[PDB]
Amino acid sequence: SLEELKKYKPKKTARPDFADFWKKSLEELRQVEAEPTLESYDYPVKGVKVYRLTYQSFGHSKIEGFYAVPDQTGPHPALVRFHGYNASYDDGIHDIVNWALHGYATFGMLVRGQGGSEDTSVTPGGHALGWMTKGILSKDTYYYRGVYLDAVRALEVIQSFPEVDEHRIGVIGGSQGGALAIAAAALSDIPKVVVADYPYLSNFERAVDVALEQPYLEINSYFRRNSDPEVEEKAFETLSYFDLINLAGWVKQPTLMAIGLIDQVTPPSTVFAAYNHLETDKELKVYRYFGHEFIPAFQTEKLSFLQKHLL
Amino acid sequence: SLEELKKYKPKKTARPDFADFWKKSLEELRQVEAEPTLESYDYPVKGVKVYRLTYQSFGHSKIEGFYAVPDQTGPHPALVRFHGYNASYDDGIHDIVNWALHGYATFGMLVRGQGGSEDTSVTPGGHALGWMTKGILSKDTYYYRGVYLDAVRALEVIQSFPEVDEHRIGVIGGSQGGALAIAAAALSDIPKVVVADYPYLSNFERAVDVALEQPYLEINSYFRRNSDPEVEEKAFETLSYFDLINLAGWVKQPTLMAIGLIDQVTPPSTVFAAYNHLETDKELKVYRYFGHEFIPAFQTEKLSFLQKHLLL
Amino acid sequence: SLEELKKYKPKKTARPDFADFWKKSLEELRQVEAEPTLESYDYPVKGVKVYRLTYQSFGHSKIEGFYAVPDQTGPHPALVRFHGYNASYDDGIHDIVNWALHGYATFGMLVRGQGGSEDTSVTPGGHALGWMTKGILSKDTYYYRGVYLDAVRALEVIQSFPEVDEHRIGVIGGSQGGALAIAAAALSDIPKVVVADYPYLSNFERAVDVALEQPYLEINSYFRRNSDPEVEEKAFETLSYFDLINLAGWVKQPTLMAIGLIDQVTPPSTVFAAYNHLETDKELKVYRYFGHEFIPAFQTEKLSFLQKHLL
Amino acid sequence: SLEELKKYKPKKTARPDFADFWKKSLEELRQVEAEPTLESYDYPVKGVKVYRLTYQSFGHSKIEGFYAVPDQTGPHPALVRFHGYNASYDDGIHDIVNWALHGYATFGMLVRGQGGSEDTSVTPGGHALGWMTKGILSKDTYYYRGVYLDAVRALEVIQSFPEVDEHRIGVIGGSQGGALAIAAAALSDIPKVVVADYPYLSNFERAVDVALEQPYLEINSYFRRNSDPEVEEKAFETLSYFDLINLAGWVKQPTLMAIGLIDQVTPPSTVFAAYNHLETDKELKVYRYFGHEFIPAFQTEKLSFLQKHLL
Amino acid sequence: SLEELKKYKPKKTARPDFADFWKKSLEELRQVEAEPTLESYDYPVKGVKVYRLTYQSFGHSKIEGFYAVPDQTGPHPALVRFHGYNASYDDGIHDIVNWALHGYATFGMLVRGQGGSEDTSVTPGGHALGWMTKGILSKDTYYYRGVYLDAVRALEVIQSFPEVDEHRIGVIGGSQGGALAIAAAALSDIPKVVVADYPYLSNFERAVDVALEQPYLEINSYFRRNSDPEVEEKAFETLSYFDLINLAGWVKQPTLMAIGLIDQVTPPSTVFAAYNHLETDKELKVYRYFGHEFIPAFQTEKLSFLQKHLL
Amino acid sequence: SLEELKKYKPKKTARPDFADFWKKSLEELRQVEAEPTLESYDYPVKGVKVYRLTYQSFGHSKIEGFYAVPDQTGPHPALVRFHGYNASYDDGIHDIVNWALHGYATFGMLVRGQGGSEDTSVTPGGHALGWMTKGILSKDTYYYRGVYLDAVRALEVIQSFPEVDEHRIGVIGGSQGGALAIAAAALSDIPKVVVADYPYLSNFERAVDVALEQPYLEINSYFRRNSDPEVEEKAFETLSYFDLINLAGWVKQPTLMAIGLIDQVTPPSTVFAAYNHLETDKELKVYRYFGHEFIPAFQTEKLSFLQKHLLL
Description:
Chains B, F: Substrate binds at residue 85. Six copies of one chain form a homohexamer. By secondary structure, chain A is an alpha/beta fold. Chain A is 35% helix and 21% strand. Chain A has one domain (1-311): Rossmann fold (3-Layer(aba) Sandwich), CATH 3.40.50.1820. A nine-stranded mixed beta sheet of chain A has the order 1-2-3-5-4-6-7-8-9. In chain A, α4 packs across α5 (176-187). Chain A is globular and about 60 Å long.
């Protein structure tokens, strides 16, 4: 039942050069000067100053997002917030401001291409409607390579802000956001804490047999349009470099996760898989009656978690 | 009412610099050497030789697709076939081969990003899931700018083939394919004939109000994510440069169209709009009981049309 | 079509005893002591104290909800927030706390029988699944009679709080919440300002013909079960006593509204009807591409509106 | 599948005070004077007289329903018919008349609050849309407490009629009706026979995990709105007092049941559970190709059963 | 809109040989000997005898159906009941008995091919899934030709029964049944009265444009498979011979009809068309909130209608 | 589940008189004179002549379909193509012509009542909407009896054509077509090869429990209307005479099959069952990401298969 799920630890797909690909990709990122930029932005709020933050990342694409700071003498604890797949509305400015009102200097990084950042990477060949399969035929060209690296830089940028306490930076997000939170934490020692609501991009090879809704199906859709058995092999190969089950091993920050047992977008199994590959101070909140949706009960859970580690 | 539809002809949205934009765009295309590449490809068919065709286009992107030729001494009539939005399966090789079996040296151009070509253009900023709104904030960066230009070059490349009779080249496609067929014909004098099934990318400002299905709704979806009123204005502005109702005026080739009266993807009105802006030897086949789908009746219609004009 | 909607103003359905019914109801409510009850409640937030607020209302029903106050020297501006139909999750505590973080001592009243309050009123006879048609055969027994009165008292309770500035109280809500916001403002002079998102319970006689989704259809559903032509007559009769188009006339507070042109739950026409019956400093924000859902662009709209009038 | 269903008999959930609760409840019912009322009702039929029957029950609620009697000298066998959840159309008068035409003095009790009767019980707090979770936080306040008691009284009233043969009274119903039929038989010795189609309100703790359709889902829906873990425990606690698997033990009348193997409203397992807890002259008609719908085959089955035992 | 519907009366499509076709068809029917067959059948009811009735009709096909007679010295009024399209379950026996219990010697004719009679007519060529388009390319071969004639014979057979009062025979049915009821009445003087619930087979040329649900869509479906435009014309040509709007002119019996304004199977317009083409003593009961379904209110309506005219 | 599926081989349901029934049925077919008729038909294609073929079959019913022949000196390899359940649009003329363009003299038999042949068989009693349950109460009256026999005759007719090489006739089809292909091959030695995509009419007793889509459900639907337990008994009895799992044993021809693992119309299990009852040179192509739809990958598979065996 859910007993078999608590025990599920798929086999990892990481390839021999897993660490070298990421070490090499971090070295390309280091190659690009951040050139951070700040610009005050007016919003109807009291006790919080809002800014437009800009910096340069992998491939020289310009990343953007709103940066809200508690209107009070710092230094402050900080949060880098990551939005969901194709679910960024008005740059999620309202959520960002609210986080700042909670006492966190928080930056909502917009995911290149979807949110309002720039994706500089060429599109090698055809792919299914969406971002999931863009550059899927090579880990060098894969969409999430750039985005993952953008997350790391996000942390590098804010960490340098005088108002930010570099030792009290948290990384949070839901679905796609949760995956970026984990990936970032796995690739960077900057974040002190991790909060992922039902994380995405996890256990691709199973998520494909079990998901009943977009956008894990984009992969299936891609394979329907490209039947080449070699294509499928290469695709799953490049996907393993970004799969949470392979990155979870590198996370040593205390991390809190959530999952709804009727979630059809991000199937419970895929989330448990990720969780069971974490070997760090961790916890998984399980909600029997919720799917891929805002879970009230968990909200208050992560507020405590964050307060107890960052405030 | 078929009556109301038959008389529907919306005011053009073409901006004052419409012609200049395309002249400048064509000049950027001319800037890139095609340097075409051919490579024999094995396929279980007799009487037809299949190839992988490659060439360079706008932004120096490698454009590809299968090229099937009747295995008989030419020169042959030629077809450049354009596939539907997100509807290219295995490069539509089977359809291409079949066209060749009909006596046409035919090339199925893969649309950069979706089919199997290479889209070299940067992604300026955010956009809705899909290609519809990529680079939507400027006609210079818009997704279909590159693709339109790829279509023109496709014609330029195959037209230079010794086995191809440059005087007997047709351009065909359905939905997105039909739009590319028309656009290509509008921007190039190479094609002698045009065949468009329920054409896409037409009458954007109405499509967004009548479409009950994807993906004219990616535009709507894009506006939901970007509420700025200035964004909507700019978006529709850049869209007018690619809208069939503005390009139809340039088509002088004999062109045949189809439309199903229950089509919810590519609404009848948007297709009539395009048709009513054509000022050329034209015809619109109307099918009361069909939607956005293969229309058997029209298939035989376009076979005759093509045979009469290209197999003359 | 926006043009037809802009000019749409249906004839009022208010019966001749409309005013008397409400005077006599507001009077039965005066009959009940409020007997408020405050109780601190722990919540992972800084700068805000959270309470459980209790009070007695019409019928001797005990109404409840969370009350969050800015943890800073009063007095503060106040908001009474009303939740949507069957859409109260965990008493919407997270939203309430967030409002307090914005500088508003805000109370989220739970709708009797729906959200967490007590509905003391008998159920006269059969009715369709839901609250819409409960006690529908008489304006004395109708479900929303009690709830409307609960809203008025809500204002009466918080207004008496020493930390609350009685002359800076706002009333807000979406859908059902928006209707309660308007109704409350119409029946009470306490609220200084009104914000309603796609308001509900408006223009019943048309809603039943244009609604393609629940719950306006509960009325239709009720008539299918009770074919008696008299029943329909009586039903629409009692409904007119609660219809926004009949109450809008009494609203003298500056009020801000929103409506999405593809809203199928709360049809644009029904909302315009309400708006066009307001005779006060008013504004209607129209969103072409939105339905019955959170509208980001409007959230910032009401923040300004509230800030300029209450802060 | 059928094999495992036949042998499915979940452990009872009846709490230690199960019997006391019902003894006390029956005592409260006895406290209220029946004072039943009859009123002739014209209906286009021959060989039958139709009446409107009224009486008082738990909480002082006036329960009603059409009462049709064979227009022939008595005494007659009698049936107390119970309608389905939210499925009472025009008081199901046509079905009632038809039963009378079959030779049964039959009364169609309308379920208080939904069918066409009065529910006098207060609504303690919030609950999910529907009746399922009304007063769910206490067995004293739970919705079906009153309704169950109404069923018992129904039998007490029609049993006192001179035209009714008290020794030949049957209790029948489908879904919700079937549950009331069984519950009534379990709480009263009046009924000689029981016939229930795919009975409802059975094996709650499993129903909530297998139901793919309303309304066993109102419970799930209720928990989504009230995440408190205590709430769920209390809810299932109060539900056990009304669960058929706990009441079936008291049924000593010959009883006939039906179940369709593709029923998604009232899952086969939940019905088998009830059946396997009956310890009397029981029979279970199983229909492989039917769901939650009128089963023609079973219709003729129960006609024989009733004719055999009552005519 | 009820306004527009009330006045809707499309031009007849009857071809010039309309009358001749039916005269010739009736002649062919007369050519076949009824050789009726009655066989007692056991059913759990009292006061009613049930039989299996058999007779021969057009094309030498054996038509069947249950025949229930009031177990009391006749002669009795009689009803020939026609079932819905693909909606005959167990020969619809339970309803035939219930009609007998109302004092009517009633026969439920099973429609050939669907119900349980025998369709002897060859299938000329391809057609869409269903009966709608079987033999559609010629009025001689069309499916409903045989069925219509079966209905006429049904009346001829039962009328000859000694227990049946030939002067008091009614014809009733819903949807397909209603169409057969009307058609039968139009082609035979035997029936004294007609009751059709939302009749089918009417205004084919519009039905195909307004129907949002089966089975009028079978025609559309047939044209998708056979694009030949001459084919659509021949089809509509043969259909006119069976269209109610063309037969309604021959009905001189008092007839009662019903229609639900949200009916999507049998669109209101098509039903109004039929009723506006009736020049007999007619009446149309209109139900705003009902679709293609059992309408309680109308049930009692037709009971009175039948009782007044037949009892 | 591929491992469980690969080993799935349900016990045959063939009744003791299985062989006799088919021997007797074939005898009745032989009783009817072919009397085949040919009629040139116009179609916009070069290198192919199209005809409308007519002949008489079981019950003296007229069976028909288009017959396309490569416009050249034969003899040619031949294909009998069978269409899907209720899925014959315009007699599938375009597909037939395309097959001819591939070098095959191919005949698309229209299934009686569906595509365009005549079903002379009486309808014994009631049945569920559709053809599935027509005459279901007896194997003598069952719908597919006639159709199966029509398939055999189809082979007998085309085989007699001078332009057809009787030694190189293939039988192909998808879903219902695949079942007819297999059935035909099982009842006739004429066909040299068999290609069936997601075959239908297979493992009825399980299909009715796993099918989430029409039309295996017509059977379920039929039982809902006829609750008599003796009806279900008789129904499954008559169905066993036409179930592929019982016929597969007779197929000697090399046969190629396909199945998509997410097929809900024709469940994988039912198809594996059929495949595992084949005792011949066989192969099953399995596609993980496809359902009951055109599978581009398998298309090219069967082209090779057919080319190797028929075009040598």
